[PDB]
From a paper:
The crystal structure of FgGS complexed with Mg2+3-PPi and imidazole was determined at 2.15 Å resolution. The protein structure in this complex is essentially identical to that in the BTAC complex (rms deviation = 0.15 Å for 292 Cα atoms in monomer A). Metal coordination and hydrogen bond interactions for the PPi group in this complex are identical to those observed in the BTAC complex. Unexpectedly, imidazole and not indole is trapped in the active site of this structure. Imidazole was required for crystallization and the concentrations of imidazole and indole were 50 mM and 1 mM, respectively. Therefore, imidazole out-competed indole for binding in the active site during crystallization. Intermolecular interactions suggest that imidazole is bound as the positively charged imidazolium cation. The imidazolium N2-H group donates a hydrogen bond to the bridging oxygen of PPi, and the imidazolium N1-H group donates a hydrogen bond to a water molecule (monomer A) or ethylene glycol (monomer B). While all side chains of both complexes are in approximately the same position in the active site, R216 of the FgGS–Mg2+3–PPi–imidazole complex in monomer A adopts two conformations.
Author numbering: 5 to 270, 272 to 308
């Protein structure tokens, strides 16, 4: 509206993904860029050198700007700040060559910036902040404990991967950006609705980050459904990617069904109507951002 512009998703090559999802780009995207800069500067200040890109993407839109385009402008910078730290902390958790000395050495710095993000969120919106802290902690713990599990189906993998990829974490941030809280009743019913959305987000990331994650497998755990399909079905990269592409399309359709099924079995409030809409923008934003984000695409990298 006055906070985001509608963007024609057909102007992008999405490999058949994102059909019937609308795409929006936050008008205050510079605040997301500012949040990511400050987070990266604090990382070098308290942790160590930067070794990768996070949410930044000036071509197709900052991660926060397209994934969360309904965010209130006064909350976009902090959300992007949090996500940028999460982007960088994510690769630390996946690392397999980190010495016990460096892990001890970086523990206090990681703690400081984590506590800095939680404190700022609590000071702005306490109810929303508590959900962010809960999901953030659950994602880190789940990743730490379960990242080495050998899954033998995409279904089993996704129960872990939806948490590892940060889908509830990002949902909690999106609610904070809306200044929105759900009742425990609404929490219960909407959990079933957004499960295929979480899976679409997780598998879409696998699709577009597989090349980069294969490049890092010498030093990082490979958590990717493309690899799983390759092993269990004895397929090469593009054939496995096609199967994941098809699986993404299935989850995308299932999400649209559950949104409309919710609307049928339950006159919804305009709050829940906004919630449903905001969730669909995660799908289109995550998809378009992953197309040429420097994080996964080296010929878009700089500096
Ligand atoms: Mg990860
Ligand atoms: Mg990762
Ligand atoms: Mg990935
Ligand atoms: Na990895």
């Amino acid at each position: 509206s006055e906070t985001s512009d509608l963007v024609d998703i057909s102007r992008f090559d999405t490999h058949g993904l994102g059909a019937n999802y609308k795409l929006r780009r936050h008008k205050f995207e510079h605040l997301a860029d500012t949040g990511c800069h400050k987070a990266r500067s604090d990382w070098v200040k308290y942790i160590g050198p930067l070794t990768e890109f996070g949410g930044c993407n000036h071509i197709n839109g900052n991660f926060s700007a397209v994934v969360l385009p309904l965010c209130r402008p006064d909350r976009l910078e902090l959300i992007a700040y949090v996500l940028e730290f999460a982007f960088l902390h994510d690769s630390v958790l996946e690392s397999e060559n980190t010495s016990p000395e460096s892990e001890v050495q970086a523990e206090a710095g990681l703690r400081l910036l984590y506590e800095r993000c939680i404190s700022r969120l609590l000071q702005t919106d306490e109810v929303c902040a508590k959900k962010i802290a809960k999901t953030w902690k659950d994602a880190i713990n789940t990743t730490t404990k379960d990242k080495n599990v050998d899954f033998q189906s995409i279904e089993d993998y996704l129960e872990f991967r939806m948490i590892d990829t940060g889908a509830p974490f990002v949902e909690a941030l999106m609610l904070f950006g809306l200044g929105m809280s759900l009742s425990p009743q609404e929490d219960d019913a909407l959990g079933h609705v957004i499960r295929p959305c979480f899976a679409a987000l997780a598998l879409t990331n696998d699709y577009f980050s597989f090349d980069r994650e294969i490049e890092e497998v010498d030093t990082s755990t490979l958590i990717n459904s493309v690899a799983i399909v390759m092993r269990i079905q004895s397929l090469d990269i593009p054939t496995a990617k096609t199967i994941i592409n098809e699986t993404i399309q299935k989850y995308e359709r299932e999400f649209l069904r559950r949104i409309d099924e919710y609307k049928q079995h339950k006159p919804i409030s305009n709050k829940i109507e906004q919630y449903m809409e905001a969730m669909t923008y995660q799908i289109s934003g995550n998809l378009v951002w992953s197309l040429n984000c420097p994080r996964y695409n080296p010929d878009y990298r700089y500096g």
